[PDB]
Amino acid sequence: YELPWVEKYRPVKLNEIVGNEDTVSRLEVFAREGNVPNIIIAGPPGTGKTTSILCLARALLGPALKDAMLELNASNDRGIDVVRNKIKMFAQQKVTLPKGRHKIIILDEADSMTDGAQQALRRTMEIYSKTTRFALACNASDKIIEPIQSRCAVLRYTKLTDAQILTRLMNVIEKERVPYTDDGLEAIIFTAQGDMRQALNNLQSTFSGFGFINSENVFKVCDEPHPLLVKEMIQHCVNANIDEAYKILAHLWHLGYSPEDIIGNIFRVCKTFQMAEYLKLEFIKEIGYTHMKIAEGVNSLLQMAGLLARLCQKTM
Amino acid sequence: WVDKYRPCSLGRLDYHKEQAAQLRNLVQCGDFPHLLVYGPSGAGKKTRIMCILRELYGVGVEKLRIEHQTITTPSKKKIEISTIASNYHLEVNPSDAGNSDRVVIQEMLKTVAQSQQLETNSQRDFKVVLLTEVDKLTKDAQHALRRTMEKYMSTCRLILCCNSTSKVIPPIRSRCLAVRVPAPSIEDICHVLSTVCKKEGLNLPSQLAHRLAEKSCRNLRKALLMCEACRVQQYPFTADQEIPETDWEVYLRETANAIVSQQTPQRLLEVRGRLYELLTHCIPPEIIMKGLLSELLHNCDGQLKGEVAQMAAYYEHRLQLGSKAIYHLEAFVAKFMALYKKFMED
Amino acid sequence: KVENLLWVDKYKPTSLKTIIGQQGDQSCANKLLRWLRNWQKSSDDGSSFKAALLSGPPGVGKTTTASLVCQELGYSYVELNASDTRSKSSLKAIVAESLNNTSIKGFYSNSVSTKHALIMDEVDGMAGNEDRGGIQELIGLIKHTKIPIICMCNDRNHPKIRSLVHYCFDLRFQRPRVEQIKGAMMSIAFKEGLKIPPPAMNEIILGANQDIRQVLHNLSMWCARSKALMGPFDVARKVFAAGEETAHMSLVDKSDLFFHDYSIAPLFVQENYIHVKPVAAGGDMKKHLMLLSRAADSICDGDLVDSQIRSKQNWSLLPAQAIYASVLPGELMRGYMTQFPTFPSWLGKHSSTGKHDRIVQDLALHMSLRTYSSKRTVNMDYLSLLRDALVQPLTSQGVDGVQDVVALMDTYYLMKEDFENIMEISSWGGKPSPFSKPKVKAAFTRAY
Amino acid sequence: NLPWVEKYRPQTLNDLISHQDILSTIQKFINEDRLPHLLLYGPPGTGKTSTILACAKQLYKDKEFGSMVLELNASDDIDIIRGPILSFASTRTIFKKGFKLVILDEADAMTQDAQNALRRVIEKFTENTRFCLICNYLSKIIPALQSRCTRFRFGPLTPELMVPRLEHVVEEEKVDISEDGMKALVTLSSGDMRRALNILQSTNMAFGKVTEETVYTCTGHPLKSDIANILDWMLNQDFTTAYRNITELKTLKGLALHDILTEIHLFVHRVDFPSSVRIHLLTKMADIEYRLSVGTNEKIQLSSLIAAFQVT
Amino acid sequence: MFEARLVQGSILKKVLEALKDLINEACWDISSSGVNLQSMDSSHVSLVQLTLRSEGFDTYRCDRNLAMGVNLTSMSKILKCAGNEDIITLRAEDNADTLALVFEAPNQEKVSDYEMKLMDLDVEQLGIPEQEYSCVVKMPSGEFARICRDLSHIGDAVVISCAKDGVKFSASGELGNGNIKLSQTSNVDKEEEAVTIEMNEPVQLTFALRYLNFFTKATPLSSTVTLSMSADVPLVVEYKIADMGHLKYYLAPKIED
Ligand SMILES: Nc1ncnc2c1ncn2[C@@H]1O[C@H](COP(=O)(O)OP(=O)(O)OP(O)(O)=S)[C@@H](O)[C@H]1O
Ligand SMILES: Nc1ncnc2c1ncn2[C@@H]1O[C@H](COP(=O)(O)OP(=O)(O)OP(O)(O)=S)[C@@H](O)[C@H]1O
Ligand SMILES: Nc1ncnc2c1ncn2[C@@H]1O[C@H](COP(=O)(O)OP(=O)(O)OP(O)(O)=S)[C@@H](O)[C@H]1O
Ligand SMILES: Nc1ncnc2c1ncn2[C@@H]1O[C@H](COP(=O)(O)OP(=O)(O)O)[C@@H](O)[C@H]1O
Ligand SMILES: [Mg+2]
Ligand SMILES: [Mg+2]
Ligand SMILES: [Mg+2]
C-alpha cells in the first residue's frame, strides 16, 4: 500500500508552500520569533491551510509536538462538553517549552463547530493565552461567531494563480518522471481551478490510469464539457448564429451534462475569451441571469436555448 | 380617542350594515367556519373581527393579556414573538419571524388546540386563532397553515386578517369564508366624524369634515387621527383649518419635491440620505414607492407618466425579490432623474 | 528577550482611568461604579436593582470594566464564564448557596475586605441543551440575592435575555469613537517602537469596526508584516480608477478584486460609486446621470444574486455576483473618485432599524387595549399623534403637563421609559424633539 | 411477478455495457490491489449501483459481505458519519484480512458539514476501508470531498449500445415488439436502461403488445401529432380561436403547460423559421417557463404563449 | 527531586476522595517539612487546609520547595487504581510536568506506575491566623456525619447553637422543623465517642448544609471530628490523620440580618 502524492509530497516546512507569499511570510516570521497569536486561517479549499498550520506548529514546538499540540478535526466530537472538558484541561495542563513557545490547539474545520461550542471556547482562548495559542482553520469565515474572530488574527487565503500550481506540478513531475505534454498540463490547470490538491489528485489519477499526460487523457478522467466545444458555441453565438450554437448545446445535453455544469463551463470560458469588451460584458450579464434562473430550479433545456437566443440577439 | 369610540357589538357598527347583519347571522348559526376577512387598510377589519368575537364568546373576550413566546429556528437563531391572547382566542402575527413563519404557525395552532382540550365550556366548543397580516406569509408557511388548519379543524377556528388576498394560495381561499370589508365611503367617514364629534360635544362643521374625508383617502383611522389632531392645535373648527399630516408623509413629500427640483448626483446623495431616514423609521418600501410615485406624477407630463408608472412598478417588483431595499429605491430614483432631466432638457 | 504575552495582555487596562471607551461623568463604567459602591442601600435611577447587565458589541471592555470596578472597591468576585456549565441544576447547586452567604475572602486575606460579588459573564452563552434552564434559574437567583450579581451579555436584543433585562440595571457599551482609540493605539504603538501613518491607523480602526481587541491584534499582525521586510478601503478605491489599470487589469483581475473580502466588497462599491465622475461622460450631466442609473441597475442585480446565495448555501453564484456588483459598475463608472472610499455605513443603518423596530413594537404592545398592529406605520402614526398629544399640555401650560402625561401614560399603559422612547423616535432630519424647546422637566422626573 | 429490472441485472462485471473504459480501469484496480475511493456520478438508471456491487462480489465473498461491506443510503439522514461510518471504518473485522468497503448511495443529499466530517474520516482510515460514493449531481458534492476520490461519470447509454440488450430481453421473453415500438421506447427512456425495461415490462403487461402508440398511451406522454396540432393553431389561426382550440385540447387530455412548452420548443427547433423569428420564439418561451415556475395562473400564461407565436 | 514513599497507602486514597468533590484543582506545596495544601472552593465559601508531615511518610526526600498544581479529579481517578494495601510512592523531578505515582502491591509482583499530568495553578496562600475559638466540640466523626446527613433532609441551612449545657443543631424546611441537641458526655470507658464541649461564650451561627456534607466525606480519615467556632469567623471542622497531619475545613457563615 503506497500512499497518494497529496501526502507523499506534502511540504514539511513553510519554505515549500507556494500559496500566498505575504501570509506565508508572516507565518515564517512567527515561526522565527515565536510568539504567535490565535490565528484563524480562512480561504478556499486545497490552498494549504492545514499544511501551513501544521508546519507552523512544527517549526514552533519542535520535538515537543507530541506534548504541546492538540488537533481536533471535524471527525472528532467537539460539542460543548468536549470544549468544556478536554480543551480546557489541555489549556490548563503544564508543559515546559522554550522562552517564547506556547502550546497549540489546532481546531481544523472551525466552521463546523456549533455556536455553543465556540461560546464555550471564547474564555478558554482568552484566559490561558499566556501559555496556550489557538490556530483555527476554515473555509467560510462567517460560520465562526464574531466573539471568536475578535480574539484571532483573521489571515485570508486566496486561490492560486496558474503559475504557482504549474511550478509545484513540475516539481512533482521531476521527482516522479511522468511523461507529459504542454496541452496536458494546461488541461490539468484548467480542471484544477486553483485547488492545489485537486491538481495533484488529477495528476496522480491520470498517471496511474494511463501513464502519459495529454489533454485528451486528462479529460478522460475529469470528464467535464470540453472547453473547446463551449468556445465554439460561444463563437457561434457571437456571429448571431442561433441554429449553429443550439447544435453544440443539444450535443452537450445529449451526453447528460447537468445544466449547472454547462453553465459553469460557459461562464468560465466566456470570462477569459477573445470578444470585444462591451460585448463580453453584455454576454456575461445574460449568462449570470440564466445561472440564477437555473440555480433557482428552472434547469430545462429551454432555459439554455433562451440564453443562447439572448446572447445572439445582443449582437443584433 | 380612536380606541374610545370604536363599536363593540355588530348591531353598533357605523357602516356596512348589511354585511354586519350577515356576520351576525353567521355567528348565530352553528359550525362557525374559517373566516378570511380582507379589505383595504383602515376600513374596519379589526373592528368587525372584535365584534364577531363579542358575538361569538361572552364579553370576556375583551379581558386580554400579552404573552411572549419563543420559537426555535432550524438552527440556534432563537426568535421571540408577541401573542395578544384572551380566554377564548389568540391573536398572533406569524410574520415577524421573517422566514421562520412556518414553525410559529404549526406550534401556535398546536398550543391553542391543546389548550382548548382543557375544559373549554364557556359558550362554544372551539377557540379562535386570529392571524393578522396573512398575505405576507411565505408560501412554505401558507402550506403549513393549510395543513394545520384542517389537522385541528374541530377545536380551533381561524380568522385570517389580510388585505388584497392576491398573494394567498388558492388552497387557503378554498377553505375560508371570504369576508370583504371595503373602505367606507366619503359620506360614511363624514357621518362617523360628525357622530364622534357630537358624542364629544364639539362643533365639527360640514365643510371641514368633508376636507378631512377627502384627505384621509377612504382611510377611517387616518380621518379620525386627523380630526383628533386638528383639535389638539386649534379647537375652534373653521372652514379653512391647516389640518396636519403625519411626519413621514411630509418627509416623503419633500423628498419627492427635492428629486423634482435638482437632477444632479449631489442631489441624488441627499435623496439617498432621505431614503435612509425613511427606511430607518421602519416604514415599508412599498409605501415609500407609492408615496414617492404620486408626488412625482404630480410633477411630470402626461406623456411621461406612463414610463414613470411602469418604472415604479418594475423597481418595486424587484425590491420584493432582493434583501436591501435601499439599493432598489436609489436605483429607481436615479433612473427617474436620468429620464426626467433628458425629457425636460430636450 | 522573547515576549510570552500578546498585546491584548501587555496593554490591558490595569487601572480604571485607562478604559479607552468610557472615562466620562456618567458612562458605562462610572454608572456601574456608583451602582456598586452604594449597592448596600439596595439590600442612574438604577439603585432599585439587584444586578447589572453590561451589554454591547464585542471587544469594547465589558469584561475589563466589570473586573476593574469590582477590584477598585475592594470587592471579590466569582466569575462564571460560558466555559462553565450553568444548567438549572448545576447553577442552583454551585452558586445558590453562595449568594446569601459570606465569602471566606472576607475573613482570610493575604487587606481583609468584605463585600463579595458575583460576575456572570457571557450570559447569552447559556443556550443549548447543556445549559438547560440557566436563564430561568438565574433570574430566580437575582430575585432572592444578597450580593451584587453583575451579568454581562453581548446582544441585549436576544430572546433568552429579554426575560432577564427586567431584573437588571441595563448598561450599554458604545463603540468607542475613532479618535479615542486612535490616541490610545498611537501611544501603544509608540511604546512598542512601531511607526504607522495616522491614515493607516484610521483605516485599521475602521476596518476592525472599532473593536479594540481586534485593532490590537491587527497592530500585532501589522508589526509582523513590518518585520517580514490590500485592505477593504484599498480595493474599494482600486475599482473606480482610470489611468493605471488599463493594461494592468483584465476580467479575471477585475473579478478577483471582489474576492479579496467578498463579504463586504459589494457594500463598499454601492456606497462609493456615487462620488465618481465618469471619464466617458465629459461633464455632460445628461450622460453622467445615465451612467449613474445604469450602475444602480447593476448593483440591484448584484443584490438579487446576493439574496439568492444567502437562502440556499449555493456558493457557485459568487462569480455572477462579482460581475453584477463589482466589475460592471466599474466599467460604467470609470472616472475619478472625488474624496475617499468612505465606509459602507449600511450595517449601522440596519442595526438602528432593528432598534427602532423593537422600540416601536414594545411601545405598541403596551397599547393593546383593543387596537394593535405589530410594528407598522399604523403605530408610527398613533405614536406621532401621541407625541403631539403629550407635548401639547406642557407646551401650552406647565400646570397641566403632569395631569395629562399621567392620564395618557396610564390610559395606554405607558411608563417613563416609554415616554423617553416616544420622544426621540419621531425626529425626522435631525430635528430637535418638541420637548427640549425647562424647569418643569426636573420636577417632572421627580414627581412622576 | 418479478420485475424485469431485477431479473436481467448484470451479475458479473463484464455484463455491464457502454462503459468499457471505466469497467476495464476498475478491473485493473481490483487486480492490482490499487482500488482508490471511487465517486460514481451520472444520470439515473445508468449502472452505478450495479457496477460497484459486481466489483464487491468480485472482491469479497458472499459470507464476508455482511461484515466487510457497509451499504448505506445517505438520504435517510453529521451523526451518520461519526456514528456507524466511523465505527465501521476504524475497526478491523476479526478474522478477515483486507480493506473494507463503504457504499454511500445518494451521496449528494449530504449536508456540507457531514461531507467535511466524512472527508476527514476518509483521509484518516484510507488503508483499511475504501469508500465508494454514488451521486447524480457532482456539483452538489463539496470540492474538498470530491478531491479525495477518483471520479467516474456514468453518462447515459447511447441507443445503439442499449438496443441489443433490449433485443435479448425481447427474445428471451415473448414480447411482440414493433420495429418502431423499440424506437418509441428508446426515445421515451432517454438513455437509462432501468426506465426502458420498466416501461417495456409495464406496457407489455398492461396492454399485451408494444408499439409506437401503446407506449405513448401507457406513459401518458404527449403525442407528436397533438403538439403539431397546437403549433398549427398558434401559427395559422386567429388569436381567439387558437386560445379556444388549445384550451379544449389541453383539458381534453391531461396536459399542463410545461409539457406543451417543452415539446413546442423542440418543434420550434424542428420546423424552419427565418432564424430571426426563432430568436423571439425562444426568448418568449424561456420567459414563459420562468413565469410558470413561480405558481401563476395558466390561463394567462397560455395566452402569453399564443401572443409569443403571434409574431407571425 | 521530591520522592515520598508511604506504606499506609489508603490514607492518600481517602484524602483524595475527601477533597475531589469540594476542590476541583489544588496546588500541593511540597517542602522538606512535609506536604501542605491550602485551597479555596470555587465559590469562595469554603477553604480546605491539608497537612501531611514528613515524619509521617515512611520515606521523604524533598530538595527544593515544589508547588505542583494537580487536578484533584484526575488524581482521584488515578488513585482509584490502587488497592487498599498498596505502598504509594510519589515522585517528581526538579520542575517536571508530571507526577509519577508507583503503587506497589505488598506481597506480589504487581507494580503499577502511573504518571499524572500536572496543571498550571497560580494560587495565593491565604493567611489564616491562629485563633482561640469560643466553642470547641470534639465528637465522634460518624456522629457528625449522621447529624448533617439527617438535617439535610429537613432544610438546607443548619443553625449551630453552642450553649453551656451542650451543642444544638437546628434546621427548618418546607416540610417541618428539626433540631438535634447533643449533650456533653461523661467519663465513660470508650474515649472516641466521648463528646467534649469546651465553650467560653454561647455562640450561634448559620451554615450551609451542602458544604457540611462535603466536609463529612472525610469521616474514614479519623474517628473524632473537632468543630471550632466563634462569632463571625468560619466554622473549623478538623479531622486528624493517623499521626501524619490533619485536614481542616473552614466554612463561612451565612449572611445575618
Ligand atoms: N500552497 C501549497 N503549496 C504546496 N502544496 C500545497 C499547497 N496547498 C496544498 N498543497 C498540497 O495539497 C495537500 C493538501 O492541502 P491542505 O493543506 O490539506 O489544504 P487545505 O487548506 O487543508 O484544504 P482544505 O482543508 O480541504 S479547505 C498538501 O499535502 C500539499 O501536498
Ligand atoms: N476600553 C478599552 N480600553 C482598553 N483596552 C481595551 C478596552 N476594551 C477592550 N480592550 C482590550 O481588549 C481586551 C479584551 O477586552 P474585553 O473587555 O475582554 O472585551 P469584551 O468586552 O469581554 O468582549 P466580549 O467578552 O468578547 S463580548 C482587553 O484585554 C484589552 O486589552
Ligand atoms: N450498463 C448496464 N448494463 C446492464 N444493465 C444495466 C446497465 N445500466 C443499467 N442496467 C439495468 O438497470 C437497472 C438499474 O440500474 P442501476 O445500476 O440500479 O442504476 P442506478 O445508477 O443505481 O440508478 P440510481 O441508483 O437511481 S442513480 C439494473 O437492474 C440493470 O438491470
Ligand atoms: N363601524 C365603525 N364605527 C366607528 N369607527 C370605526 C368603525 N369601524 C372602524 N372604525 C374606526 O377604525 C379604527 C380601526 O380600524 P380597523 O377596524 O383597525 O380597520 P383596519 O384593521 O383595516 O385598520 C377604529 O378604532 C375606529 O376608530
Ligand atoms: Mg485542511
Ligand atoms: Mg468578555
Ligand atoms: Mg442505484
From Swiss-Prot, chain B:
MF terms in GO: ATP hydrolysis activity; ATP-dependent activity, acting on DNA; DNA binding; DNA clamp loader activity
Keyword set includes Metal-binding: no
Alphabetized InterPro entries for the sequence: AAA+_ATPase, DNA_pol3_clamp-load_cplx_C, DNA_Rep/Repair_Clamp_Loader, P-loop_NTPase
Entry keyword Zinc: no
PANTHER family (alphabetical): REPLICATION FACTOR C / DNA POLYMERASE III GAMMA-TAU SUBUNIT, REPLICATION FACTOR C SUBUNIT 3
Role, per record: Subunit of the replication factor C (RFC) complex which acts during elongation of primed DNA templates by DNA polymerases delta and epsilon, and is necessary for ATP-dependent loading of proliferating cell nuclear antigen (PCNA) onto primed DNA.
Protein name: Replication factor C subunit 3
Organism name: Homo sapiens
Curated annotation (Swiss-Prot), chain C:
Function noted in UniProt: Subunit of the replication factor C (RFC) complex which acts during elongation of primed DNA templates by DNA polymerases delta and epsilon, and is necessary for ATP-dependent loading of proliferating cell nuclear antigen (PCNA) onto primed DNA. This subunit binds to the primer-template junction. Binds the PO-B transcription element as well as other GA rich DNA sequences. Can bind single- or double-stranded DNA.
Subcellular location as annotated: Nucleus
The protein's assembly and partners: Large subunit of the RFC complex, an heteropentameric complex consisting of RFC1 and four small subunits RFC2, RFC3, RFC4 and RFC5; the RFC complex interacts with PCNA and the interaction involves RFC1.
Tissue-specific expression: Wide tissue distribution. Undetectable in placental tissue.
Designated name of the protein: Replication factor C subunit 1
Domain of life of the organism encoding this protein: Eukaryota
Family: Belongs to the activator 1 large subunit family.
Disease named in the record: Cerebellar ataxia, neuropathy, and vestibular areflexia syndrome: An autosomal recessive neurologic disease characterized by imbalance, cerebellar ataxia, impaired vestibular function, and non-length-dependent sensory deficit.
Binding site for ATP: S55, G56, P57, P58, G59, V60, G61, K62
Transmembrane segments: none
From Swiss-Prot, chain D:
GO molecular function terms noted in the UniProt entry: ATP binding; ATP hydrolysis activity; DNA binding; enzyme binding
Annotated keywords: Acetylation, ATP-binding, DNA replication, Nucleotide-binding, Nucleus
Pfam families linked: AAA, RCF1-5-like_lid, Rep_fac_C
Binding positions for ATP per the UniProt entry: G42, P43, P44, G45, T46, G47, K48, T49
Family in the record: Belongs to the activator 1 small subunits family.
PANTHER family, per the entry: REPLICATION FACTOR C / DNA POLYMERASE III GAMMA-TAU SUBUNIT, REPLICATION FACTOR C SUBUNIT 5
Stated role: Subunit of the replication factor C (RFC) complex which acts during elongation of primed DNA templates by DNA polymerases delta and epsilon, and is necessary for ATP-dependent loading of proliferating cell nuclear antigen (PCNA) onto primed DNA.
Protein name in UniProt: Replication factor C subunit 5
Curated annotation (Swiss-Prot), chain E:
Residues that bear Phosphotyrosine: Y211
Summary of subunit composition and partner proteins: Homotrimer. Interacts with p300/EP300; the interaction occurs on chromatin in UV-irradiated damaged cells. Interacts with CREBBP (via transactivation domain and C-terminus); the interaction occurs on chromatin in UV-irradiated damaged cells. Directly interacts with POLD1, POLD3 and POLD4 subunits of the DNA polymerase delta complex, POLD3 being the major interacting partner; the interaction with POLD3 is inhibited by CDKN1A/p21(CIP1). Forms a complex with activator 1 heteropentamer in the presence of ATP. Interacts with EXO1, POLH, POLK, DNMT1, ERCC5, FEN1, CDC6 and POLDIP2.
GO CC terms, sorted: centrosome; chromatin; chromosome, telomeric region; cyclin-dependent protein kinase holoenzyme complex; extracellular exosome; male germ cell nucleus; nuclear body; nuclear lamina
InterPro entries referenced in this protein's UniProt entry, alphabetically: DNA_clamp_sf (IPR046938), Pr_cel_nuc_antig (IPR000730), Pr_cel_nuc_antig_C (IPR022649), Pr_cel_nuc_antig_CS (IPR022659), Pr_cel_nuc_antig_N (IPR022648)
Pfam families: PCNA_C, PCNA_N
Feature: DNA-binding region: 61-80
UniProt protein name: Proliferating cell nuclear antigen
Keywords (A to Z) from UniProt: Acetylation, Deafness, Disease variant, Disulfide bond, DNA damage, DNA repair, DNA replication, DNA-binding, Dwarfism, Host-virus interaction, Isopeptide bond, Methylation, Neurodegeneration, Nucleus, Phosphoprotein, Ubl conjugation
Effect of Y250A: Complete loss of interaction with UHRF2
NCBIfam families: pcna
Sequence segments annotated as region (Interaction with NUDT15): 7-100
